[PDB]
Design a protein around this ligand. Structure first.
Ligand code: HEM
Ligand code: HEM
Ligand code: HEM
Ligand code: HEM
Ligand SMILES: Cc1cc(C)cc(NC(=O)Cc2ccc(OC(C)(C)C(=O)O)cc2)c1
Ligand SMILES: Cc1cc(C)cc(NC(=O)Cc2ccc(OC(C)(C)C(=O)O)cc2)c1
Lengths: 146, 141, 141, 146
């Protein structure tokens, strides 16, 4: 994606303060609570009956850290997101059958988590930088869908 | 909100569809799968080949539901109650996809009803499909 | 449909917003203009620079309308009737933009309510904003 | 945009049969009728209260012709839509203030008009190729927005 040097530094700087595992579980759990239809892929994770059950679910937490870990590695390749997520795109389309809209929803939920986590540090300009990144990753993951 | 003119327009256009409803349902699905590839993610268990009996069978169910909705246009929430439960709690189709199918239904109707698909009927049909879509996603959360 | 739990969650969160409603509204607008540049096409008659009186004033109007919607959550179509007419007949803002402002309002609240923005409240606020957006676009056609 | 040989042939062959004058007027008129809020950009066009008033309006027909005419030139440069529409893109942003979401609606309405006009000949594969073209043009026109 096209990020100005200042936008790239804002993203990087902020990310260095992120506990990837904590935020990954938090984002995925909120995705499942706020947009419950995304729970369709996780019926094997067990109890997702209530918000506390979703947030406290160890399998939701484990999938969150895996998803956010790949996201995190993607920030080191902001200039080649399509090439970085090509295989994951194919996997999500051909084997997992994940509607790409889910990636957009996760992206917005992630932006809300960063805002809740960082408060005033998550300024309007910093949010704008993250919106571009999250849209870029969602576009990269949907690129190989056919 | 569907005005009395909207209801008349919808009843008139659907009446002309009549017995071809199922065939138009299948064509609409085919148009959707080809035009918007991501919608195929909800049917990994189907043969989506052109001519597929699974698609033809599903198109007929979709079309019958719409026929039911037209007949009960003044009472859609209850008429489609089981269907909204199904999509909200089992199928869990992301809401955006209903706009994709609605468009494809419109394109199918346009290609088959040259005389009845006037600008006014087009508007009424689009309003109608948006209402059906709204009822079908009303229990999502 | 906002459940009774949703209504309780919205009132509690909005109560905490309190006197800052106006400045949070202005912040949400600034976040929207930066994150989603296309929304600026609706404000070519405004000085959109940071802290302008026009943005601060509009932010206050938006927040007051939301406070009104919270106070009459059981009857929103009636409470927002005039606003629905205005957006439908004069402003004519494309419906997608309401989702963009809703997201930016949600991020603003998240950034300012660390204790209150729990997963359940986040869901309730998102549903509420979606409801307000539906009422405001209900008379479009 | 990238289209397969069959898709490019489908688009080109069908377009050779399109009377830009006639189709442009239909497409713009139906846009104003089905999505009434789009009328906000045409206050100086006259009577737009009824479907018959919009469809018979001479300024609507003239503008529709201009729009589709420019759309036609883009079909000849399918491999470089962004460069082809750069000037009109800035124009639509800076001078006209047209929310790019309107380009999407027009494209969908155009597809309905081609289907209404060509019937059986506007097959599912042909529609698929046109949906790509129309999405590409809308994207090309929104490219210079800032
Ligand atoms: C930033 C977005 C995302 C990234 C970077 C991402 C990344 C990944 C990764 C790295 C895996 C592991 C694949 C493997 O083991 O080979 C995975 C698996 C999977 N993902 Fe995604 N993912 C994303 C979004 C989503 C979303 C939003 C959903 C659905 C709501 C989803 C559903 C799944 C499922 C069901 C699996 C299989 C898990 C398992 O078998 O244990 N993903 N994803
Ligand atoms: C106008 C909108 C729609 C109507 C009226 C409708 C109606 C129906 C009906 C009647 C069924 C069959 C239920 C039964 O077996 O009794 C069904 C099933 C289903 N629908 Fe929907 N639907 C609509 C839109 C959608 C959309 C947009 C998608 C996804 C792109 C979708 C995906 C499904 C799936 C996956 C099934 C199950 C098919 C099977 O396994 O047999 N539906 N729908
Ligand atoms: C939660 C959703 C929203 C609410 C509650 C809301 C509320 C309002 C209110 C209370 C006014 C002032 C009316 C007056 O002065 O009499 C207004 C004006 C306006 N709104 Fe909306 N609005 C919403 C969303 C939108 C969105 C998404 C946009 C566009 C991106 C928008 C664009 C406008 C414009 C251009 C004006 C005119 C401003 C002026 O020139 O003073 N609105 N809105
Ligand atoms: C997607 C295809 C589109 C193309 C290729 C396009 C093309 C054009 C062209 C060539 C002009 C004439 C400029 C001149 O002669 O100086 C123009 C003007 C204009 N366009 Fe677009 N346009 C498109 C869509 C839209 C849409 C969807 C809207 C809004 C609903 C819009 C609103 C306008 C307006 C307001 C003008 C000014 C008309 C006037 O001078 O009164 N355009 N466009
Ligand atoms: C920034 C941005 C941009 C866009 C297009 C959408 C959003 N997010 C949303 O639309 C979230 C959202 C809200 C409601 C949704 O559907 C249901 C059926 C619950 C509804 O409309 O009430 C589906 C999704 C955010
Ligand atoms: C192919 C495709 C893809 C997408 C995302 C949307 C569409 N089109 C639409 O959804 C049309 C549409 C319908 C209704 C709209 O808003 C109002 C307020 C009238 C409503 O929801 O009823 C706004 C737009 C078509």
């Amino acid at each position: 994606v096209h990020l100005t040097p200042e936008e790239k530094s804002a993203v990087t700087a902020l990310w260095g303060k992120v506990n990837v595992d904590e935020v990954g579980g938090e984002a995925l759990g909120r995705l499942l609570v706020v947009y419950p239809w995304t729970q369709r892929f996780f019926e094997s994770f067990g109890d997702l009956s209530t918000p506390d059950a979703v947030m406290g679910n160890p399998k939701v937490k484990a999938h969150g850290k895996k998803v956010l870990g790949a996201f995190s590695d993607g920030l080191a390749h902001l200039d080649n997101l399509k090439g970085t997520f090509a295989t994951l795109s194919e996997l999500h389309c051909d084997k997992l059958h994940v509607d790409p809209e889910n990636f957009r929803l996760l992206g917005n939920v992630l932006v809300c988590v960063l805002a809740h986590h960082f408060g005033k540090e998550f300024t309007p300009p910093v949010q704008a930088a993250y919106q571009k990144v999250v849209a870029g990753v969602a576009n990269a993951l949907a690129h190989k869908y056919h | 909100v569907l005005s009395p003119a909207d209801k008349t327009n919808v009843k008139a256009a659907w009446g002309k569809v009549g017995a071809h409803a199922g065939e138009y349902g299948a064509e609409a699905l085919e148009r959707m799968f080809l035009s918007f590839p991501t919608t195929k993610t909800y049917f990994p268990h189907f043969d989506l080949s052109h001519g597929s009996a699974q698609v033809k069978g599903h198109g007929k169910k979709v079309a019958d539901a719409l026929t039911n909705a037209v007949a009960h246009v003044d009472d859609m929430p209850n008429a489609l109650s089981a269907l909204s439960d199904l999509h909200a709690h089992k199928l869990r189709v992301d809401p955006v996809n209903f706009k994709l199918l609605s468009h494809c239904l419109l394109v199918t109707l346009a290609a088959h009803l040259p005389a009845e698909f006037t600008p006014a009927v087009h508007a009424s049909l689009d309003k109608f499909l948006a209402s059906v879509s709204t009822v079908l996603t009303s229990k999502y959360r």
